[PDB]
């Protein structure tokens, strides 16, 4: 810890929990090791008031060149704050931790797909365009996701979005032993991601959310998914989708990345869609 460098540890303080103030209880983890280890934790603030969170041990930080890194990953994500958008708690520095706020529902692909939960056509438009804020939001700051999709998505005790699976929170999945379907087609031919690329994703997200957690192109192997959209093929409308959000989606996966929407006119366009019921 003494062998860090001071200058560095002094910028890192406004992301660092104190262990008076964080309790993690090591004994029971959330969803059922899907997560990997991923436990229950209890984050006091300045006015002791008691914040349940979820905390990650990141168990392949082991050395002071990739625990630097890693204060450098709490800088940057500290600093990324909207509603739509999972956020950093905090930092503890037994391997480093990650403590990110409770999402009581879990992950939206789950929600969605979970028979026993009946959202309406509102309710599902409405974690889109929740998903689309998010984005707006990270588009604003040169942020680029590489991997949107609605198993990447949270949703809180509010049914509140959290757009998540990025920065100290990305992956997420990592679950021990003893996305080409959602990538646009230039990230597919060119491995290169950018904002346009981010929104060809959401529109499959958007895809995913009105078929109720379907899974894209189940007859499509991997390999033959670049031929298909080649062939101008694209994911058919969903059954209970409106024509307008159909539109939106088609307009999202276009073979030319320029001619897509921003994630602002996607708030715009999707809101407005949401308003009509
Ligand atoms: F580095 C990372 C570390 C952890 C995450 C995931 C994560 C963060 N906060 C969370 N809060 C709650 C749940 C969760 C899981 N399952 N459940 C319910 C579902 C409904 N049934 C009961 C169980 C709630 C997951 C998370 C991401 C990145």
């Avoid at 990324?80 to 956020?87: A, E, K």
């Avoid at 949270?154 to 699976?165: G, I, N, R, S, Y």
């Avoid at 379907?181 to 959401?202: G, R, Y």
């Amino acid at each position: 810890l003494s062998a860090l460098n001071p200058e560095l540890v002094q910028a890192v303080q406004h992301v660092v929990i104190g262990p008076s103030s964080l309790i993690v209880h090591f004994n029971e983890v959330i969803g059922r090791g899907h997560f990997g280890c991923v436990y229950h934790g209890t984050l006091l603030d300045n006015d002791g008031k008691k914040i349940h969170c979820a905390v990650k041990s990141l168990n392949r930080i082991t050395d002071i060149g990739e625990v630097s890194q890693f204060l450098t990953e709490g800088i940057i994500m500290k600093d990324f704050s909207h509603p739509n958008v999972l956020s950093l708690l905090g930092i503890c520095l037994g391997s480093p931790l990650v403590v990110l706020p409770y999402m009581k529902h879990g992950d939206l692909r789950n929600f969605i797909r979970n028979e026993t939960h009946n959202p309406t056509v509102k309710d599902l438009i409405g974690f889109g365009l929740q998903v689309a804020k998010g984005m707006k939001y990270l588009a604003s700051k040169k942020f680029v996701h590489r991997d949107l999709a609605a198993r990447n998505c949270m949703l809180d005790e509010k049914f509140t979005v959290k757009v998540a699976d990025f920065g100290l929170a990305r992956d997420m999945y990592d679950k021990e032993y003893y996305p080409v379907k959602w990538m646009a087609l230039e990230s597919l031919q060119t491995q290169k991601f950018t904002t346009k690329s981010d929104v060809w994703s959401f529109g499959v997200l958007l895809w995913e959310l009105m078929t109720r957690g379907a899974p894209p192109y189940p007859d499509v192997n991997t390999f033959d998914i670049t031929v298909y959209l080649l062939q101008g093929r694209r994911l058919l409308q969903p059954e209970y989708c409106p024509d307008p959000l159909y539109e939106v989606m088609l307009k999202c996966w276009h073979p030319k990345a320029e001619m897509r929407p921003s994630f602002s006119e996607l708030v715009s366009r999707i809101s407005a869609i949401f308003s009509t019921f």
